[PDB]
């Protein structure tokens, strides 16, 4: 992948290996020089052009901070300039935008959504596309994060722990993300285990959270406060006063008080 | 001059008819024909001082050429057009103000919103929450099939039961028309008779037959053998079969939590809604499955709320906790506040009408 | 202007709700 | 990137970089402002940012992501530092509607301070911005020297 | 009528008669 | 323009025979039993 003139064909030369500290640096000088042309945004004012300055190149600018943003774990050279991506594939419906890195980035940031802790954000971008089992299902790239949501929140983590290790995406497509997705597994037992432990043993935690040492252990529980004590881990999960959002429930003082006014000034609109 | 101008003004949707069903040849250039109308003698002519002037199907024949995927497509396969459409569709938006639009705005974003499911981007509806409070003016006929019909849909994605159960109405609501009672009354049973499967039963198999096809319905009758009754086995001889009937629209989608309810439900059809169950016990149900595994069953029901248990890692003692002290205090009070306001409900319209 | 559109629009919504306030006074 | 490293773009020499997407965008931010809801923090620190000239259209997209939102006050006040960004003559809903609010918000500090002082539109107490919108569609039909459409104003 | 009603499972035959066959056989 | 001087007076209409009649209801009510009972 050789170069031509500006920068981003020049972003091809350090694409082989390694080298994205610079290419990131190298984004604000070329969509800043790419402006003072009206044919940067692929809009309807141009007439049948797939050529440079217009849409191809387009494609290749956010290349850098989309492949190499995962690869190199930075959110901010994404986020926006994903947001700026969408529009470029299609407004609303266009079949001349497929490609072999639709399907990547887009199905690798589905489950990088874990830190907004959105559900619904997850499949909101999967009800976008005219066809379901012929792209999504068909595809193994964007069917691995479908068949994770769907078998995590359902309860059943051997099924889909044999997707990540036994999958055949473990040469090329899996590099970037490992510990994101492998702890999400096990991330929702403790979760689960509040209401269902009151003890727990050392020696099946190796078992269920995969923990071979007992500091990776106490060292959750102290962010989770819970109580550690000799042999086993006793589990109590204790509440406390004003819990959360969403008034009349624990917040405002004297509940009552609305009840008595639903029993009298309720009676105000009855009369009159 | 003046009052020949008002004359044409219902001339519109009048000659439109035989342009309909049977004569599908080139329905876009009647879009360019019905610019004709929109642009000049409308917009650049009226001042905007006027309501009941304008309906909701007078652009509403556009997007029914879209699904054809026959013969019109738009005016070519790159759906390219669709983008100044988009702002056509919106550009009436605009028009809808403070002073203006007091009735037409409430049908505006609903086929623009109807225009959503499988194009266009549905997390702006969290965002049309800003302008989506306005006052109803009034319910005439048709209106009340057209809200939530499509809008049924939304709860495939936050993944959300009880509220099926309310919005569901809106399909079975002066559903059967001329032309609805083949093309829209099926999609109403549907989505119907899946969410009858996620929480509550089926009232009768053959009473859904006088609207919707019992075919069309019949892989959800087995599926009551299977979902309803949590059975794993039965389940996948199901899908398996009727995949051909599960290429519909979003009807795939549906049964991602038609497999979700056989570990839910199944839990109700084990013996762990009684209080002490041992896992040996609980390996003879689930042995399709595995035996280490079991423990993930039950403890992530207990976070949803389904069910609360207590896990033992020995011989698997599981004590599930029986709750005879509700609807106390506070747990009724959320029914009690609905029960208030129904007296004042019909009460004030004596004063209206 | 929206001032002169807004308070017509005030006119019709409130005067079914005075008449029957006159008839029921009437009817008293 | 959030809304606040949008700022970091403008370190640099681009006044179109929000500006360049504006050609289908500006006319229309009636309808597509519900993308903004995101980047409202955005929108102030648009008008505060120095190296930005542009803020005056900035000031101008604050008032016309408020209007249809239903508040009227930030329809107009933003609309103050804008200078002319926008043609007055295509007499749309977005020239009318603020003739009656510009003439409605201005009684609101006038029968007020004027019993103190007699010009309350040359200090700080008031915007004097507002002079300037006074002087654009107030003013197009005074071009005649016509009380009769001014009458109502300074009663 | 639910499921329950239109189930039939006509199960009710063969488990009778093999209960019984059960019992006079561990004697 | 001129006309927006006369709109207030439609206006002003209903909202003063409004609460006028309103309260009158309660004081016709009590006062009914008074001249009710006295025949």
């Given at each position: 992948?050789?170069?031509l ?26 969509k800043?020089e790419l402006?003072?042309?009206n044919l940067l945004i692929?809009d309807?004012?141009?007439?049948n ?6 849409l191809?190149?387009?494609?290749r600018?956010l290349e ?7 690869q ?7 986020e926006?300039?994903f947001n ?11 079949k001349?935008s497929?490609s ?5 980035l ?8 874990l830190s907004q802790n959105?559900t619904?954000?997850?499949h909101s971008?999967?009800?976008?596309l005219?066809?379901?089992?012929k ?10 994060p479908?068949?994770?949501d769907?078998?995590?929140m359902?309860?059943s ?7 990540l290790?036994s ?8 590099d970037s993300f490992?510990?994101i ?7 929702e ?5 509040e209401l ?5 043993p050392?020696?099946?935690?190796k078992?269920?959270?995969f923990?071979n ?5 106490e060292?959750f ?13 006793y589990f109590?999960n204790?509440?406390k006063?004003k ?5 009349e429930?624990?917040?405002?003082e ?5 009840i008595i006014?639903?029993?009298?000034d309720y ?5 009159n | 001059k003046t009052?020949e101008?008002?004359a044409?003004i219902?001339?519109?949707m009048?000659?439109?008819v035989?342009?309909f069903?049977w004569?599908?040849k080139?329905?876009?250039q009647?879009?360019?024909?019905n610019?004709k109308?929109?642009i000049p003698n409308?917009?650049?002519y ?5 309501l009941?002037?304008?309906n909701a199907?007078?652009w509403?024949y556009?997007?029914?050429?879209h699904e054809?995927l026959?013969?019109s497509?738009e005016?070519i396969?790159s759906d390219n057009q669709?983008i100044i459409?988009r702002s056509t569709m919106?550009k009436?938006l ?7 639009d007091?009735?037409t705005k ?5 086929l623009?919103l109807?225009?959503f499911?499988n194009?266009?981007?549905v997390?702006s509806?969290?965002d049309?929450?800003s302008?989506?409070e306005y006052?109803?003016?009034?319910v005439?006929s048709?209106l009340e099939?057209?809200?939530f ?10 993944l959300?039961?009880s ?23 099926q999609?109403?049973?549907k989505?119907?008779?899946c969410?009858?499967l996620?929480?509550?039963?089926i009232?009768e198999?053959?009473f859904?037959?006088?609207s919707?096809?019992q075919?069309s319905?019949?892989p959800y009758?087995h599926?009551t053998?299977?979902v309803?009754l949590?059975?794993?086995k ?13 290429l ?7 049964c991602?939590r038609l497999?979700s ?11 762990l809604t009684?209080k002490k169950?041992?896992?040996?016990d609980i390996?003879?149900?689930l042995?399709l499955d595995?035996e280490?595994?079991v ?7 207990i976070?949803?709320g389904?069910?609360?248990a207590?896990?033992?890692h020995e011989?698997?003692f599981?004590?599930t906790?029986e709750l005879?002290?509700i609807?106390?205090?506070?747990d009724?009070?959320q029914?009690?506040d ?12 004596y004063?209206?009408? | 202007?929206?001032k ?5 629009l005030?006119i019709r919504?409130?005067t079914?709700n005075v008449?029957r ?5 009437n009817?008293l | ?13 681009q006044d179109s ?6 050609e289908?965008?500006?006319?229309v ?6 993308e903004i809801?995101?980047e409202?923090?955005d929108?102030?620190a ?9 803020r005056?259209?900035?000031?101008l ?14 329809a ?7 200078k002319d ?5 295509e007499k749309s809903?977005?020239?009318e509607?603020i003739?009656?609010?510009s003439?409605?918000?201005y009684?609101?500090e006038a029968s007020?301070q004027?019993?103190?002082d007699e010009?309350?539109?040359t200090?700080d107490?008031?915007?004097p911005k ?5 002087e654009?569609?107030i003013?197009?039909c005074?071009k005649?020297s016509?009380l009769?459409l ?6 | 009528?639910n499921?329950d ?7 009710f035959?063969?488990?009778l008669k ?7 056989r561990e004697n | ?11 002003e209409?209903?909202?003063?025979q ?5 309260d ?7 006062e009914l039993?008074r001249?009710?009972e006295?025949?």
């Amino acid at each position: 992948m050789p170069s031509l003139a500006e920068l981003t064909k020049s972003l091809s030369i350090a694409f082989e290996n390694g080298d994205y500290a610079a290419c990131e640096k190298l984004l604000p000088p070329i969509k800043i020089e790419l402006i003072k042309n009206n044919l940067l945004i692929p809009d309807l004012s141009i007439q049948n052009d797939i050529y440079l300055n217009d849409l191809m190149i387009t494609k290749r600018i956010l290349e850098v901070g989309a492949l190499a943003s995962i690869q190199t774990f930075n959110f901010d050279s994404f986020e926006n300039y994903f947001n700026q991506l969408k529009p470029y594939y299609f407004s609303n419906n266009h079949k001349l935008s497929e490609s072999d890195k639709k399907s990547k980035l887009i199905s690798l940031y589905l489950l990088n959504l874990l830190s907004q802790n959105n559900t619904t954000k997850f499949h909101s971008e999967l009800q976008y596309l005219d066809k379901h089992i012929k792209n999504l299902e068909d595809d193994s790239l964007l069917s691995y994060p479908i068949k994770l949501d769907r078998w995590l929140m359902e309860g059943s983590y051997q099924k889909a722990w044999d997707l990540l290790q036994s999958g055949s995406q473990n040469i090329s497509e899996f590099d970037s993300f490992t510990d994101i997705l492998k702890s999400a597994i096990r991330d929702e037992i403790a979760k689960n285990t509040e209401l269902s432990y009151d003890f727990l043993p050392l020696s099946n935690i190796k078992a269920l959270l995969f923990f071979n040492n007992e500091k990776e252990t106490e060292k959750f529980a102290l962010e989770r406060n819970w109580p550690i004590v000799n042999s086993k881990v006793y589990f109590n999960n204790q509440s406390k006063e004003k819990a959360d959002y969403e008034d009349e429930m624990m917040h405002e003082e004297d509940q009552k008080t609305n009840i008595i006014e639903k029993a009298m000034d309720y009676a105000i609109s009855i009369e009159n | 001059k003046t009052i020949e101008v008002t004359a044409e003004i219902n001339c519109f949707m009048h000659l439109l008819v035989q342009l309909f069903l049977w004569d599908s040849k080139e329905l876009e250039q009647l879009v360019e024909f019905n610019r004709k109308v929109v642009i000049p003698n409308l917009l650049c002519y009226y001042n905007l001082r006027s309501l009941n002037l304008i309906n909701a199907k007078l652009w509403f024949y556009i997007y029914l050429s879209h699904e054809t995927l026959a013969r019109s497509s738009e005016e070519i396969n790159s759906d390219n057009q669709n983008i100044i459409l988009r702002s056509t569709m919106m550009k009436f938006l605009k028009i809808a103000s403070l002073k203006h639009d007091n009735e037409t705005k409430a049908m505006l974003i609903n086929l623009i919103l109807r225009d959503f499911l499988n194009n266009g981007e549905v997390d702006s509806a969290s965002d049309f929450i800003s302008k989506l409070e306005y006052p109803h003016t009034d319910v005439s006929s048709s209106l009340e099939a057209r809200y939530f019909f499509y809008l049924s849909k939304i709860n495939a994605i936050q993944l959300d039961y009880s509220t099926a159960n309310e919005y569901i109405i809106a399909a079975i609501r002066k559903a059967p028309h001329n032309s609805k009672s083949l093309g829209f009354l099926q999609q109403s049973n549907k989505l119907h008779c899946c969410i009858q499967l996620l929480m509550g039963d089926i009232p009768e198999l053959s009473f859904f037959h006088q609207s919707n096809m019992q075919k069309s319905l019949l892989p959800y009758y087995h599926l009551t053998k299977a979902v309803k009754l949590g059975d794993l086995k039965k389940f996948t001889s199901t899908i398996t079969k009727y995949k051909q009937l599960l290429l519909k629209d979003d009807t795939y989608q549906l049964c991602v939590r038609l497999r979700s309810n056989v570990i839910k439900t199944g839990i109700r059809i084990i013996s762990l809604t009684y209080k002490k169950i041992s896992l040996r016990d609980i390996c003879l149900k689930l042995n399709l499955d595995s035996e280490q595994t079991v423990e993930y069953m039950v403890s992530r029901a207990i976070r949803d709320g389904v069910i609360e248990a207590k896990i033992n890692h020995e011989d698997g003692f599981i004590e599930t906790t029986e709750l005879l002290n509700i609807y106390d205090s506070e747990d009724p009070q959320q029914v009690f506040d609905e029960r208030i306001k129904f007296a004042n409900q019909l009460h004030d319209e004596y004063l209206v009408s | 202007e929206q001032k002169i559109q807004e308070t017509e629009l005030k006119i019709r919504s409130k005067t079914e709700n005075v008449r029957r306030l006159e008839a029921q006074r009437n009817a008293l | 990137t959030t809304a606040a490293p949008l700022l970091a773009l403008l370190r640099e020499n681009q006044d179109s970089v929000k500006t360049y997407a504006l050609e289908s965008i500006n006319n229309v931010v009636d309808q597509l402002w519900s993308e903004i809801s995101n980047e409202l923090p955005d929108i102030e620190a648009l008008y505060d940012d120095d190296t930005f000239s542009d803020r005056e259209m900035a000031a101008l997209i604050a008032s016309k992501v408020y209007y249809n939102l239903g508040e009227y006050e930030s329809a107009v006040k933003y609309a103050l530092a804008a200078k002319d960004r926008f043609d007055i003559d295509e007499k749309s809903q977005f020239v009318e509607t603020i003739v009656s609010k510009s003439i409605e918000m201005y009684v609101q500090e006038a029968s007020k301070q004027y019993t103190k002082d007699e010009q309350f539109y040359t200090k700080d107490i008031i915007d004097p911005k507002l002079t300037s919108i006074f002087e654009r569609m107030i003013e197009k039909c005074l071009k005649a020297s016509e009380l009769k459409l001014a009458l109502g104003i300074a009663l | 009528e639910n499921w329950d009603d239109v189930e039939v499972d006509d199960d009710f035959t063969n488990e009778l008669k093999a209960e019984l066959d059960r019992y006079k056989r561990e004697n | 323009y001129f006309k927006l001087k006369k709109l207030e007076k439609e206006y002003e209409l209903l909202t003063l025979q409004e609460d006028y009649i309103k309260d009158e209801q309660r004081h016709l009510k009590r006062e009914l039993k008074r001249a009710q009972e006295e025949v």
